Amino acid sequence: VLLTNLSEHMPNDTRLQTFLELAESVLNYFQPFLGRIEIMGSAKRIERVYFEISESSRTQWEKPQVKESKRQFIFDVVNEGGEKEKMELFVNFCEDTIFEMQLAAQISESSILTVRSALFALRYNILTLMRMLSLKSLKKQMKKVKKMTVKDMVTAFFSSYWSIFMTLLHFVASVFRGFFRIIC
Amino acid sequence: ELRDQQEQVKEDMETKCFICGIGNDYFDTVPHGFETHTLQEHNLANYLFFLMYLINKDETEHTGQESYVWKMYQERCWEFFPAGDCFRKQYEDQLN
Amino acid sequence: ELRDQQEQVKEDMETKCFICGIGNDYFDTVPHGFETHTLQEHNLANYL
Amino acid sequence: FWKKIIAYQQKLLNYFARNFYNMRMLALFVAFAINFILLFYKVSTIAVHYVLEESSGYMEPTLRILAILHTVISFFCIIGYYCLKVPLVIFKREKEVARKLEFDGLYITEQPSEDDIKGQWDRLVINTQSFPNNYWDKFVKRKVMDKYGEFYGRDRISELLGMDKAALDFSDAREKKKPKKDSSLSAVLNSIDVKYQMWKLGVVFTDNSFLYLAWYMTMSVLGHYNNFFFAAHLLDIAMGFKTLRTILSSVTHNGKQLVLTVGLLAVVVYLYTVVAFNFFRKFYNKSEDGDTPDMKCDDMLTCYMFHMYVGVRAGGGIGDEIEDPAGDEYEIYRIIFDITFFFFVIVILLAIIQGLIIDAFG
Amino acid sequence: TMSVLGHYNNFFFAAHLLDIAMGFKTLRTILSSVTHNGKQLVLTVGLLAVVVYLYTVVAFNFFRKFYNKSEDGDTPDMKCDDMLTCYMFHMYVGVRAGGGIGDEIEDPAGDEYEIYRIIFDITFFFFVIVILLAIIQGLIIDAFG
Numbered sequence A: 001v002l003l004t005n006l007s008e009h010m011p012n013d014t015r016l017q018t019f020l021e022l023a024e025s026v027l028n029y030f031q032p033f034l035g036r037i038e039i040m041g042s043a044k045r046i047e048r049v050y051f052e053i054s055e056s057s058r059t060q061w062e063k064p065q066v067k068e069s070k071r072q073f074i075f076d077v078v079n080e081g082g083e084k085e086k087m088e089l090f091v092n093f094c095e096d097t098i099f100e101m102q103l104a105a106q107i108s109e110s111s112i113l114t115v116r117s118a119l120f121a122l123r124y125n126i127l128t129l130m131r132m133l134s135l136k137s138l139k140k141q142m143k144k145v146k147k148m149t150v151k152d153m154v155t156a157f158f159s160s161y162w163s164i165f166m167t168l169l170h171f172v173a174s175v176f177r178g179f180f181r182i183i184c
Numbered sequence B: 001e002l003r004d005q006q007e008q009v010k011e012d013m014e015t016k017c018f019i020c021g022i023g024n025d026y027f028d029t030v031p032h033g034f035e036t037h038t039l040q041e042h043n044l045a046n047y048l049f050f051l052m053y054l055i056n057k058d059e060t061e062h063t064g065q066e067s068y069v070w071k072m073y074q075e076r077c078w079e080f081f082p083a084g085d086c087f088r089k090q091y092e093d094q095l096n
Numbered sequence C: 001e002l003r004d005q006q007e008q009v010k011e012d013m014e015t016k017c018f019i020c021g022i023g024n025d026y027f028d029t030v031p032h033g034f035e036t037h038t039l040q041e042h043n044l045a046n047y048l
Numbered sequence D: 001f002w003k004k005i006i007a008y009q010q011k012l013l014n015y016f017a018r019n020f021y022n023m024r025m026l027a028l029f030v031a032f033a034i035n036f037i038l039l040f041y042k043v044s045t046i047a048v049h050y051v052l053e054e055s056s057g058y059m060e061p062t063l064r065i066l067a068i069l070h071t072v073i074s075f076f077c078i079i080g081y082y083c084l085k086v087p088l089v090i091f092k093r094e095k096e097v098a099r100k101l102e103f104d105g106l107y108i109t110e111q112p113s114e115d116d117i118k119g120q121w122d123r124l125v126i127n128t129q130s131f132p133n134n135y136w137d138k139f140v141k142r143k144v145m146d147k148y149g150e151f152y153g154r155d156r157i158s159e160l161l162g163m164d165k166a167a168l169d170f171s172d173a174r175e176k177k178k179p180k181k182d183s184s185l186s187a188v189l190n191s192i193d194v195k196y197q198m199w200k201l202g203v204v205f206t207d208n209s210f211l212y213l214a215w216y217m218t219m220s221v222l223g224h225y226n227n228f229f230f231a232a233h234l235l236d237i238a239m240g241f242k243t244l245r246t247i248l249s250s251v252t253h254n255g256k257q258l259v260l261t262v263g264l265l266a267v268v269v270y271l272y273t274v275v276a277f278n279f280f281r282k283f284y285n286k287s288e289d290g291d292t293p294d295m296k297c298d299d300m301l302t303c304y305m306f307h308m309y310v311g312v313r314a315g316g317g318i319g320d321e322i323e324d325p326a327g328d329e330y331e332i333y334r335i336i337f338d339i340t341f342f343f344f345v346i347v348i349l350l351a352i353i354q355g356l357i358i359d360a361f362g
Numbered sequence E: 001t002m003s004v005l006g007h008y009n010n011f012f013f014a015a016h017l018l019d020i021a022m023g024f025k026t027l028r029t030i031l032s033s034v035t036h037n038g039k040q041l042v043l044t045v046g047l048l049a050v051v052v053y054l055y056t057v058v059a060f061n062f063f064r065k066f067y068n069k070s071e072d073g074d075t076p077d078m079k080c081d082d083m084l085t086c087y088m089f090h091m092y093v094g095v096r097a098g099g100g101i102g103d104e105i106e107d108p109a110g111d112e113y114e115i116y117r118i119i120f121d122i123t124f125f126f127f128v129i130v131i132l133l134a135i136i137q138g139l140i141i142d143a144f145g
């Protein structure tokens, strides 16, 4: 806290900067528990206040019922509340939430496969097209190249893309079948 | 009216800070400035945790600022809440 | 148009003072400032 | 040897890439010709035959020629898209995965959400040797290696990225490599990278526009088996034009709210069906002949179908269809039933459902 | 020219009542509201014609025995044996009907295609009557506003 206060109040001191790099890790560890607010001080100036936040406070602040109350309070305070009474409503909500998180401790103390199926369909169905090139069984195509002509050139060029489109159709059909099986 | 009131509520939260009420642009002059202001400087959770901490802490161990805020809370005076001003604006000049 | 004209009339009365025409925020910088201005400083009944 | 066929192949590639849009105009004109010709069918005779009726006789062969032409043009439009826009999509995907791998370490420090098909499929490309095939930065692997090699293990990073550490420094120093000729079939089929091509095919298959063109081509192919399948190609103008595309998008702009409102309507009509089934059942005869009655609410499936079909569509409501209640002991109850049905279903809910889409358009 | 033709047929003088619609300001505004968004209006009408045509295709292929429009059993007047007639029936008696094409075509109860025809009618009512026609009207009303 002292290092953070000094850093925020001395913004342009390399001498304190060096201490900051030397103490980076401690500041990182204490980051979750370091509470920092701004208030309207007695000297008619804005001041920053540093304080301790307990871990249990966060564990209860991310309670579900606390989030629901937070949403309700925000909605009500921003629609059905004045700017004068906004702070009074906020502090009353803070008291209510403190009581709620005190009760939460007492009570507490004691899709993916749709993506996976599509990915598997991709792998399998692209492998179906890839097996030809991986088996290297293009010896008949090489023989055709030995008798190369413009007609054979154009037909092979078209046939490659036709095979790609065939593979896409198979992929789409497989995805539809997988989705049907999943929903049923 | 109900739907666009809800939309107005949301847009107001992403446009202005809850406590100070300053617009997001002034903080957004620098990158991530509004997020920094709403997560570190002015945070609802931070204020609530400060109130809980001030309640839990012993009275004799209060600092000057904590005692001031405690007296204001006990007299139900909310002047300590920053209204239309922040640390960056109050020290806008010699800081920057 | 008639309904939202009536709503505009109302909102204008709770937003600005009738005589001076200054906005409520300037008076509301302090608590209950607009109410103080509209009930003690600038009041229709007081002028009448 | 190959230099005289590869050049012609690339020439065909460039020709299709250049004429992609013109063939997309021609494919739209041909379908609007085919459907206009199709509009002159009649049923003539049991087995019925669909015969093209015309005073002339010169549109029947024209329909077959146009069907073949449309099929060929759609195939050429697929080829043109694959030549033109696929490399840009691959470039963007390769840039995004590289940026995430370097700046955020999406596969070293963190992991994908296991529900992101894109992120999970991109796991394959990092291991491939042929990475930034299209992206400029050919050394993102070395950058990741330097950045995360000591904290996360040099061997671990090398295995993840499918690299050999010695080769980079040996190439920076002196080296003796030997190039090989593409003439050898063994050489070229070894040079082909199976894993990167599989990843590329996955990207292309997951691309939306390629799926749209594949659907177009499938419809064109099915048009040969049944000529009326060519009528689905008239929906293509609805995406070609801007405001029609806006109208189509307006349907799904508020899809969640629309589906929930439809479910609420189905629940309300179901509650009314429950009430009618329990109390007002003799009013649901729908036959004029006294010999046989056709009761529409003896079985509740039939009753719910009657209320959802003939009830929502009717302007006045279910009372426009069901029997008049005058003189009955349940007259006032049935009257309240009909008035509330008309108010809640026709006046309120249907108006909300329509207004959602109209407001989305606006 | 209208005045001259009025001599040959006196009813041609009725076209001169449109002149007040341009003489007055708000009537001129109403007339201009029709063509203020003419491009969007024409495109929306074309989309409606395409949708009703797809529905006509579906009805012609599958739901054809439901389109008899004669009460006398002696002679049937089938409105969808020829697709020109079917498209005219859908565009004329279908768009104008409040409930949709199902208000006019025969009831599907007891048929093997009951659920398919019911989905057909409900989707026709939703897409044509509820959605597209409302958009077409709203374009001109908003132009006036």
Ligand SMILES: Nc1ncnc2c1ncn2[C@@H]1O[C@H](COP(=O)(O)OP(=O)(O)OP(=O)(O)O)[C@@H](O)[C@H]1O
Residues within 6 Å of the ligand: B013, B014, B015, B016, B017, B018, B019, B038, B039, B042, B043, B044, B045
């Ligand atoms: N003083 C403030 N404290 C906190 N948030 C503020 C403040 N002023 C404005 N905001 C806005 O409120 C939002 C923070 O909301 P919060 O962190 O509770 O969750 P959220 O935005 O509802 O979503 P999620 O829970 O998924 O993160 C941001 O949009 C932020 O800009």
Ligand SMILES: Nc1ncnc2c1ncn2[C@@H]1O[C@H](COP(=O)(O)OP(=O)(O)OP(=O)(O)O)[C@@H](O)[C@H]1O
Residues within 6 Å of the ligand: C013, C014, C015, C016, C017, C018, C019, C038, C039, C042, C043, C044, C045
């Ligand atoms: N100069 C002004 N004098 C009086 N009221 C003003 C003036 N300027 C604005 N107002 C507003 O007019 C309202 C005062 O109205 P008034 O006291 O006559 O009764 P009201 O608001 O109609 O309700 P009620 O009679 O129940 O108190 C307040 O909303 C006040 O803010």
Ligand SMILES: [Ca+2]
Residues within 6 Å of the ligand: B060, B061, B062
């Ligand atoms: Ca002390």
Ligand SMILES: [Zn+2]
Residues within 6 Å of the ligand: B017, B018, B019, B020, B021, B022, B037, B042, B086
């Ligand atoms: Zn603030």
Ligand SMILES: [Zn+2]
Residues within 6 Å of the ligand: C017, C018, C019, C020, C021, C022, C037, C042
């Ligand atoms: Zn005043």
